[PDB]
Ligand binder design. Structure first.
Ligand SMILES: Cc1cc2nc3c(=O)[nH]c(=O)nc-3n(C[C@H](O)[C@H](O)[C@H](O)COP(=O)(O)O)c2cc1C
Ligand SMILES: Cc1cc(NC(=O)c2c(O)nn3ccccc23)c(C(C)C)cc1Oc1ccccc1
Ligand SMILES: O=C(O)c1cc(=O)[nH]c(=O)[nH]1
Length: 366
């Protein structure tokens, strides 16, 4: 536990959060990150944290989840924070404002957040030019083990979701190491309902056709991001279509529209997706189920409620090859990234694993 770690968690972050509502704080965090105004990330990544998956090398398995850098403004500052990979978005085809404010809420007693941003997005064209301005720098980062993902959304007024996602593949696919199709945002009408098995097969067939049409060095992996709120039938159907079509991986999970018993925050009954600690074990159980339904042959990125090495390793043993976090960054600040990495390496050694790779799916072999 470095000095920075306790100072940020016990003094600095609680003070700033006391002065700034969550949306204003989010905006200032993006600005400061984009300018490089961050503490020293001292942790050096060891060989045991390296993972090779989705056609790329990841120097460590801890990424920043979608929704923090929605518009691609802070990618290099996020690598400087120590993340092994960065995912931007969600990005919609046209710019759109999102839902009226207030639309973000903190539940500090639960280590949780509720949000109904509604896909506020600068749009594909603005994000395209931002990534083009650093495209070759990113190629060098990716070669050195720091890949980039892009998360694709749809506009609120769209009549055909599949054409929204196709446009995103055509415009940002050539700039991404992997693309994400959300079947799971809680704050757009009809989005998650993209589950009708034949409809989902139609959607993903069109996405993969568009992807396969891109030139070889600009052809990304394609992943599906799902909610934790699916029925057992929904999960069976998703696993089936994913294997049938050759989808490259899954992200598990988005926020939940459930409200687990025991939440204490005054704002627990606000509409929106809940993230952070109340989501942690629901997300881990969804990883465990999707890994089994796909026979361990489809890489999973595990996400929901991760703030320690134990949280990360539980998801890896359940089936994740990589993990992401977001809500913990908002309460701990930048030092949380090195904390998770240091604790994960210690636990791997304690449990007798040679590295991250040896622990993926290990609970299923017991
Ligand atoms: C404020 C906020 C905005 C988010 N926006 C997006 C988004 O645009 N697209 C997406 O796929 N997930 C979005 N997410 C979900 C996260 O990517 C992640 O799946 C979820 O928050 C669980 O991780 P966590 O508990 O570590 O925060 C958002 C989450 C939060 C808290
Ligand atoms: C990494 C980070 C995050 C945040 N905060 C948020 O992002 C945030 C929040 O506070 N609530 N929230 C709800 C939904 C979504 C986001 C949020 C803040 C604010 C408290 C200013 C600062 C941050 O970086 C620092 C901290 C110290 C020194 C240098 C950089
Ligand atoms: O409201 C959004 O933009 C949003 C919130 C969230 O939790 N997940 C997502 O995919 N989008």
């Amino acid at each position: 536990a470095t000095g920075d770690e306790r100072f940020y968690a016990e003094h600095l972050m609680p003070t700033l959060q006391g002065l700034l509502d969550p949306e204003s704080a989010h905006r200032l965090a993006v600005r400061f990150t984009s300018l490089g105004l961050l503490p020293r990330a001292r942790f050096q990544d060891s060989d045991m944290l390296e993972v090779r998956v989705l056609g790329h090398k990841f120097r460590n398995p801890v990424g920043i989840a979608a929704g923090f850098d929605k518009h691609g403004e802070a990618v290099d500052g996020l690598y400087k924070m120590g993340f092994g990979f960065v995912e931007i978005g969600s990005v919609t085809p046209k710019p759109q404002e999102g839902n009226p404010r207030p639309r973000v809420f903190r539940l500090p007693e639960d280590q949780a957040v509720i949000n109904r941003y509604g896909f506020n997005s600068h749009g594909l064209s603005v994000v395209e030019h931002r990534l083009r301005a650093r495209q070759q720098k990113q190629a060098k980062l990716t070669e050195d083990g720091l890949p980039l993902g892009v998360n694709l959304g749809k506009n609120k007024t769209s009549v055909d979701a599949a054409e929204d996602y196709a446009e995103g593949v055509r415009v940002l696919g050539p700039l991404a190491d992997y693309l994400v199709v959300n079947v799971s945002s809680p704050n757009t009408a009809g989005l998650r309902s993209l589950q009708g098995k034949a409809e989902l097969r139609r959607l993903l067939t069109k996405v993969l056709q568009e992807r396969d049409g891109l030139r070889r060095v600009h052809r990304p992996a394609v992943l599906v991001k799902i909610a934790p709120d699916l029925t057992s039938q929904d999960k069976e159907d998703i696993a089936s279509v994913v294997k049938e079509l050759g989808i490259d991986g899954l992200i598990v999970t988005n926020t939940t529209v459930s409200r687990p018993a025991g939440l204490q925050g005054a704002l627990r009954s606000e509409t929106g997706g809940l993230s952070g600690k109340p989501l942690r074990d629901l997300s881990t159980q969804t990883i465990r189920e999707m890994y089994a339904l796909t026979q361990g042959r489809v890489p999973i990125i595990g996400v929901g409620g991760v703030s320690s090495g134990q949280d990360a390793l539980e998801k890896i043993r359940a089936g994740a090859s990589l993990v992401q976090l977001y809500t913990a960054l908002t309460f701990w600040g930048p030092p949380v990234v090195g904390k998770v990495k240091r604790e994960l390496e210690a636990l791997l050694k304690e449990q007798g694993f040679g590295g991250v790779t040896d622990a993926i799916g290990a609970d299923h072999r017991r």
